[PDB]
Each structure stands twice: as C-alpha cells, then as structure tokens.
Design a protein around this ligand. Structure first.
Ligand SMILES: CC(=O)N[C@H]1[C@H]([C@H](O)[C@H](O)CO)O[C@H](P(=O)(O)O)C[C@@H]1O
Ligand SMILES: [K+]
Length: 381
C-alpha cells in the first residue's frame, strides 16, 4: 500500500538471540552490518513477510549470518522485525544460515509460510568448492514454517538430507533464492541449485524438490543445466518453466514430464541481459483473464560488473515471446560488496490485486509497491 519503505536498515537494526541477549554486529552502535538476499511472501490476510540474510559483521558470504524476518500488516508502512532462523553458533566468525527461498501455500487447508535456507558452520570457502563428499559434512538445508501468519517459525523435520544422501552425486543443495510455488494440484515446489560431486563433469545443476505435505520431499530423476544456478520456477499449463541466472543472457528451460527432461523455453530464454557475473532474478506469473503473463525482476547492470545497477521489472509475453521493460524501480548503481537481488510477490485477495518487490539497496532491504504497473503487465499476452 505504501509506495516505498526500508524493511531492514544497514547499520540500523538490533536483534536479540534465543536467550534475549543483543547480537552485537559490526555496524555502528553494534548493529547488524549488512542485509542481503531478500525473499518475500504475501498471505491471504494481506500480510507481507520478508526474509533476508542478517550479515551481522560483513557482507561476505562466509561470515556470521542469521535469517531475519520482517512482517507488515499495514501495506508495507511499518515493520515488525526479528530473527526467524538462528545459525548454530559453532564458529563466531563463520556460522551461518543463508540464501532464503520462501513459499506461501495452503497445505491441506492450512495457510503456511515455508522458508528454506542453507546452513554451514566451519566452511570458509564458497560452497561450490566442496565436492569431495556426498554430501559435504558441514552442509545442511533447513526448513522452517509459520502457521500463524508469519508471527512464529518452527523447524520442520524433513527428509531432505536423506534424499540428497541417497542420490549420492550431490555435495550440497540450496533453494533457488526468492520464492518457490504451489502448483495447481496443490504440490509445493522449491526450485533448487546443486553442487555435484567431483566425479560429475557438470559442477552445478538446477532442478526442484516437491512435496504434498511439506515434510516428505522428493527429487525428480533428471537435471537441468546449471549456468549461474540461482533460479525460479513458474507453472505454465502442463509444464514447469525455470528462469536461471547466467553471466550475460538469462536462461529458461521447461519440463513437460515433471523433472525428467528439460528443453529450452523460447519465450523467456535469452531475453534479459544481466551482463557480467549475472544476478539472481525473481520470476512469477500473473493471471490475465484465462491467460498468464510472467513478471520478472533482475539488474540491468550498466557498469557490467558487481555493482548490478538498475534493478528492473520486465513483463514476458509467454505466447509471443515479447519482453518489455516495465519499470526500472531501483535505477541506481549498487554496492559491489553485495547488490542486485530482488523478490516479487503478486497476490489477488478477494478482488484486491497487489504486486510488491523487495530488493537490495546499499546494504539495506527496500520495499516498493508496484501495483500501479499491473494493467500494463496484464496486457502483455
Ligand atoms: C551460498 C552462497 O555462497 N551464496 C552466495 C552466492 C554464491 O557464492 C554464488 O552464487 C556461487 O555459488 O554468491 C552471491 P553473489 O556474490 O553472486 O552476490 C551471494 C550469495 O549469498
Ligand atoms: K559469491
């Protein structure tokens, strides 16, 4: 409802641990230093829930991180904040939970918010460097859920570690970043990225995990090419279509056999250029009559580097393959320490449609209401 607000302020937030003691970060006055990787979900009550890495000491990936959650019930004007998932606190310099992917769904009639993050404790190198073990012993992928509209989160005892181990060719797995989805048949789907074991020629692959109850998960038999691995999936008729990060042009593939084989999807394949290094992007579908339109956000990256400037909203015509820039909502050069990520959230509650975005803005996480752009996006079919 509000047009724009700051969800998490770099060097402006103070969080407390499980015992009620304040977490003294490296920010001014002992605040959390930097926020990254925003994920957002809107509920049937109109509640906006935002998750993000609370990188307490540094913006670097291998650092002390907790998953923060902010909840707004007044259209994004004010935010109630807290830590949703705490890292294990084994290593004060490296313990972390990171890269959230959320899903808002109705599981057997109960509206649930699921959040999945990767967890590490002693690894001091980038996750893609660990390929000797199946899986890496330092790694874990945890899932938390909220059944009270984002107020409290609880760990879900899942079989995810089991399926990865059983596969035997996966060193580590992570969510695609941003948001997953609930299919028409009710199944929950989390797009995933995976680092394969050393013997596999392809270092990274993309796929997804699915579940009916959110407790028992499955992995399909096939694998999609990895590229920059971060990705989102959308349901289009009887297909699952992904949108993957890649240095240069984004890639898009579709499965018509539920994860067994993937072929490039022309309407979205190589349509948006993120330039050097690539960036994570959010891709969701928006209904228009009895048709669908895909809305997407990622950085134009005008400096062709890690600054990832100009985080923009695009509309993808799934039928014709046309693409159009709808709005450059953050037309600024980002902080090379960590920038460019975003997450879109569309929802139609009763007769009210809303389109929101959450994105990285120089260490902080900002929110913008993009609903005014819906008529233009919805006409792209
Ligand atoms: C688990 C993890 O490391 N996530 C980080 C990834 C990852 O290192 C790369 O995607 C290579 O796998 O990098 C991005 P970015 O630096 O491109 O902004 C920040 C993420 O927090
Ligand atoms: K990185």
């Amino acid at each position: 409802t509000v047009e724009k607000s700051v969800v998490f302020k770099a060097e402006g937030e103070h969080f407390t641990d499980q015992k009620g003691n304040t977490i003294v970060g490296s920010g001014s006055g002992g605040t959390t230093k930097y926020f990254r990787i925003p994920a957002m979900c809107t509920t049937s009550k109109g509640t906006i829930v935002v998750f993000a890495d609370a990188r307490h000491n540094t913006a670097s990936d291998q650092s002390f991180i907790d998953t923060a959650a902010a909840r707004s019930t007044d259209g994004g004007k004010t935010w109630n904040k807290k830590i949703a998932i705490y890292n294990d606190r084994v290593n004060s310099k490296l313990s972390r939970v990171m890269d959230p992917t959320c899903i808002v769904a109705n599981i057997q009639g109960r509206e649930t918010i699921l959040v999945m993050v990767g967890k590490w404790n002693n690894n001091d190198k980038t996750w893609g460097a660990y390929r000797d073990k199946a899986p890496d012993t330092d790694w874990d992928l945890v899932l938390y859920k909220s059944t009270d509209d984002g107020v409290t989160f609880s760990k879900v005892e899942t079989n995810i570690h089991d399926i990865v181990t059983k596969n035997g060719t996966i060193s580590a797995m992570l969510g695609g970043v941003g948001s997953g989805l609930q299919l028409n048949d009710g199944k929950l789907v989390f797009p995933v990225q995976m680092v394969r074991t050393k013997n596999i020629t392809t270092v990274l692959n993309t796929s997804f995990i699915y579940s009916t109850d959110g407790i028992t998960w499955s992995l399909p038999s096939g694998y999609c090419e990895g590229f920059g691995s971060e990705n989102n999936i959308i349901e289009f008729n009887a297909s699952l279509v992904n949108n993957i990060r890649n240095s240069g042009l984004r890639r898009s593939f579709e499965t018509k056999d539920f994860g067994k084989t993937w072929t490039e999807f022309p309407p979205m394949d190589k349509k948006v250029d993120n330039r050097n290094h690539g960036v994570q992007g959010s891709t969701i579908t928006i209904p228009s009559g009895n048709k669908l339109v895909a809305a997407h956000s990622s950085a134009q990256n005008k400096n062709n580097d890690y600054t990832r400037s100009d985080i923009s909203l695009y509309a993808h015509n799934l039928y014709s393959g046309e693409v159009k820039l709808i709005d450059d909502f953050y037309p600024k050069v980002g902080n090379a320490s960590g920038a460019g990520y975003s997450c879109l959230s569309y929802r139609k509650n009763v007769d009210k449609e809303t389109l929101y975005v959450v994105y990285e803005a120089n260490g902080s996480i900002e929110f913008q209401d993009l609903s005014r752009h819906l008529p233009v996006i919805k006409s792209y079919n």
